[PDB]
Symmetry: C4
Subunit: 374 residues, 4 copies
């Protein structure tokens, strides 16, 4: 993942949420270096293990209690256990990916520094820092308000329907796991959006340099080809770093969307208190936004990477210089055999098409379920 | 979208249906220009908002009425609300796409003028105008008769089963929204069919120029390559202009097809009045024709664009001139890395394959639903 | 479709089954020519219309009879009507494709003659004639015995459970339509297998000419490239000729497989007479064999066409002659941008993958249906 | 399949499990040769036929017994018969593939020897032998303990719920068929992993030779291209050898996963003895491990084969030698048109994506089934 000064605070968040057991330090001549932090690695492992144990322990006491409010019937038990276990699995996979991703992180950061060295005019450090910090703050604030509203509505329903603080305490670890999941989403989205921005800047450089002395252009094209290859390598590195984590995040999004939609439709049919309906609608919106935060950056990066070949062809059709058109032909040959789609550890390609697939499931699972009640 | 004299009347229809908030005016030396029309933009926004509010208000009064004829039971309420809301969503998305699509429209029209300047022998202005006007008139006439028949059968059923004009008045806005949807279909089909026709004309020029003095052919091949690239850019521009609108139109087609088929099968099982059966069959035919009007032009354009590479290869195998065969090799290289499939904002590729997918859903959703009644 | 002497009898069968309204006649200097036969065209149209009317009339009298044996309950009526109508639709589509496919047939036959002129050593006229006639005879014999067994078991069940010859007479037209469908399958399989055989012969020529004086090889490679392009054009011509017919044939295969499997499982659960079980098993085998007869030739042709590029690359790596390696490079360039997959009028690609898709449906439709009985 | 000294013992296992009716013998000057073993071929055919007959006979006596413990109800009969028949089908297909795969085996082994002759520095004979023998021993030990545990829990349940040794004897042949299936998995995994290892070694050679006198490098690149083509041919040979067997193995994995998950959920709902729950969980883990053992090697080989083009491009961008860059261009041209994905006899491509598809089924089949109980 990306560790840059412009979004250094992001890294700190990832370090505080048991997802970045690393330490970043400038050396003498610039050059931030990322090394393993044994203290923070131990802290992250212990925190993840303790929190998973705590949430499962709370679930087990809720099931083995003389008055349950969320376990209750067998189907409710199964749904709640599946949801909690899916979140737990996503959290554990993210912590594991951050645990053994030191070498990939250093390689990606070195490649990103090398790439950003060339694209000096298009840096926009202030704008990128502002956007990244705004995204992180917005996501954290939204998840905080949503967790507060959920706990408030749950305590309200348990109070109207008397020994509820114990259940709330048992269920707090689930909410902290949701916080960690939000942090994981923030980290992955930041890295993928950085890759997409660098691809867009490369395309803009290629467009400006030729649509709007020959040796400067020759090594410019050479550096552009090198940067495109390095960006492809960075995409592959991010895939290796976060593939299984993103796969389990997508599984979590699908499961939560289906379960929340089914519960919302059932509650609307039963015509119960509207506050739970608003809470469920907010949860649906949050899950859809999570799915978008995962899918959109990968699709944007893949689309921006594939456009470079058209600009290269247009450049080729507007060159009367032989060594530089030879370099352009080499660039076109390199781009023809190239991929930049983020792969969830090979199981699927992460782009907007995933959304369609999810719909094709979310509808089907609903059609079997929604009308089975009646 | 396309704004040309040959189908200028089409644009007027799109302007009258709150879908084209633009003004087209010739300047001095030919050259139609498209500019933003503030009056018509405000009119379109106000009309869309007022009509959506009116149809939802009619639905809400129908639900909160002492005698409902379309809301009634909970499942009927859900089906009717989903259908109306889907049409509303498609209408709103189309109006939004036309609202903020000024720059794309001007770019597409300038590119189309540049392309059509080269293909002077193959213009067929009278034929294209006749076909476009016939398509628009046929679609409007069909939707008018269908809406009249639907309102007639609904008023007949409500009269035989007494205070019905109020419900008809409440439901008129739904029919006007259907009119706007038909206009949106007409506009998109016109643009996509124009792109397909231009691709076919380019292919015919390439076939005729070589299957049936060398510098004329050299710049002819250069202009053909430029026109093919510009047509690809126009396809991408149309995708950017109408992607989300086409996606929601496809969702509308699928939902309406499934709902109408289910209702028709249920009515046939109940063996009720046959007039409603004929009305439902007409609605099914109309929805299928809408789906075809969306899918067929995109598939035709994609197929016609992909054929150019075969003609280019055949030309390459029949050339003994070195600079022009070099140009032909450049054309082949450009065509090899090229796409022209219309994408519904990246979620799916719009071609005839979509039909198959729809069947794979329409059957499944029916199998779960049709036999669940018995 | 293919009209050659080696399988001329096949054409006669297609002429007798209202599928080939053409007349083939040698001219003076060899050169069979295919022309429109007005008498046979009128005969085919009248026979198809009369037979469709007869089968639907028999179905309608069976439904409106005081004792039905196949209509009976509403679900049985729906299943029988859907099956009969699907067969009718496939028959009508095949007759329509043969009705307006004169120009495609002549073009395909001329291209096939031109191709076969080059591949003189690999002709095997006796072997191809024997195989084609054996396939046609086997298919006709199998369908005859299956229809006889089905009518025998139906008359036996109606006799044990008395005025049955009337129902048998009403249902005979369905069996004649099955005969026409078998003829359509034979025709399509013959054409596709001929295309695949020609592709294989081209590949064998390419392998033998180089793995086992230079101008002979140069024009040999030129003729091989021309023949490959012509074979691709022939595949596209067959697609244009039989796309919608093959699509409806595949729909028929899927529907019949699902319905027969469901009926067989229901009968086995009810533990009724075993003779109907054997008849249903034979029908399942026949439907699977029909699906294979449609899918396998297209997949074989597509696989054999795609292999040529590997042989061309191997030839390129073993050539020290400059004009002929230039020709080989042109051949490789032509093969790189090329497709030969049979497309069912653009809706789907016909290959073995279709089988998988069918399973993914046949299982699902069964899971919803088989366990719904219990 | 692969017959090498490093894993010669593996072959012996495949010979003892009626899957490798061959005999491997060194000739005078090295060069192991594989010939048909008539004695072992007859033994394999007889053993497979006798074992299939024995397991079906045991099933039939269990069904026609005055006290059944696994047939019982109709749905239990159907599930057990389908599972046993699926295992039988996989076993028969594997034995048939090994029966008529002599020529493919010799061709693959000769090609593998030719390839391994070039990659002399990267041999790791001890490591490969250790890994292969460890994999075989681990798989056999796991299946042995699982079969023992299953028979123990079945005899325990039948004893607590008395004439059980007869049923255990009737069901032993099913367990021996499971042993044969495990052997088939071991053989296929060994061959595919060998292909993947050779691809990885080729990539490592290409990386080392250039990232870290010119004629040596020229014939080195030539030999690398030859080895890559031969590895592709070996992948195609393995596909031809084991396609239908792998397809039926995948069908077996899907069916067993779905059935075991459904039975486990039903048992957990019924809250019966936990020992059967642990046994079912172990069976689920084993089926998932089988599916991984089939899918992972093919995906790894396909991924390692596709990476060579990037290394070739990087080499091309770092060469100032004209004949060798010409050879590199030829290598790039060969790699551009090339595939190495294992195909299950054309029906599907075997990679990690299959897993996703399986989930998309396993969920759906469960959603229809799991909640239908309640």
């Amino acid at each position: 993942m990306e560790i840059s000064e412009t979004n250094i605070g992001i890294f700190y968040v990832s370090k505080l949420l048991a997802l970045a057991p690393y330490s970043a330090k400038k050396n003498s001549k610039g050059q931030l270096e990322i090394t393993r932090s044994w203290l923070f690695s131990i802290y992250s492992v212990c925190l993840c293990l303790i929190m998973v144990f705590l949430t499962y322990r709370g679930l087990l006491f809720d099931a083995n209690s003389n008055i349950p409010v969320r376990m209750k019937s067998a189907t409710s038990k199964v749904v709640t256990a599946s949801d909690v276990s899916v979140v737990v699995l996503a959290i554990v996979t993210g912590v594991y990916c951050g645990m053994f991703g030191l070498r990939a992180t250093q390689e990606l950061n070195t490649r990103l520094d090398k790439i950003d060295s060339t694209l000096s005019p298009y840096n926009n450090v202030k704008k990128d820092r502002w956007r990244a910090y705004a995204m992180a703050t917005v996501s954290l604030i939204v998840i905080g308000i949503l967790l507060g509203l959920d706990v408030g509505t749950w305590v309200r329903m348990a109070q109207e329907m008397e020994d509820t603080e114990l259940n709330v305490q048992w269920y707090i670890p689930f909410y902290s796991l949701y916080f960690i999941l939000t942090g994981l989403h923030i980290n992955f989205a930041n890295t993928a959006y950085g890759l997409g921005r660098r691809y867009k800047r490369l395309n803009q450089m290629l467009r400006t340099s030729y649509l709007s002395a020959t040796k400067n252009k020759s090594l410019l094209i050479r550096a552009m080809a090198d940067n495109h290859e390095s960006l492809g390598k960075c995409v592959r590195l991010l895939s290796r770093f976060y593939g299984i984590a993103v796969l389990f995040i997508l599984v979590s999004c699908l499961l939560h969307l289906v379960a929340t939609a089914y519960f919302l439709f059932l509650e609307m049919l039963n015509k119960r208190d509207n506050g739970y309906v608003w809470v469920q609608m907010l949860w649906i919106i949050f899950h859809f936004l999570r799915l978008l935060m995962v899918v959109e950056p990968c699709h944007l990066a893949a689309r921006e990477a594939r456009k470079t070949i058209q600009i290269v062809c247009e450049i080729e059709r507007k060159v009367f210089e032989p060594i530089l058109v030879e370099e352009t032909k080499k660039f076109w040959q390199q781009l023809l055999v190239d991929d930049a789609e983020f792969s969830a550890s090979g199981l699927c390609r992460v782009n907007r098409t995933i959304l369609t697939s999810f719909a094709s499931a979310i509808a089907t699972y609903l059609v079997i379920l929604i009308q089975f009640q009646k």
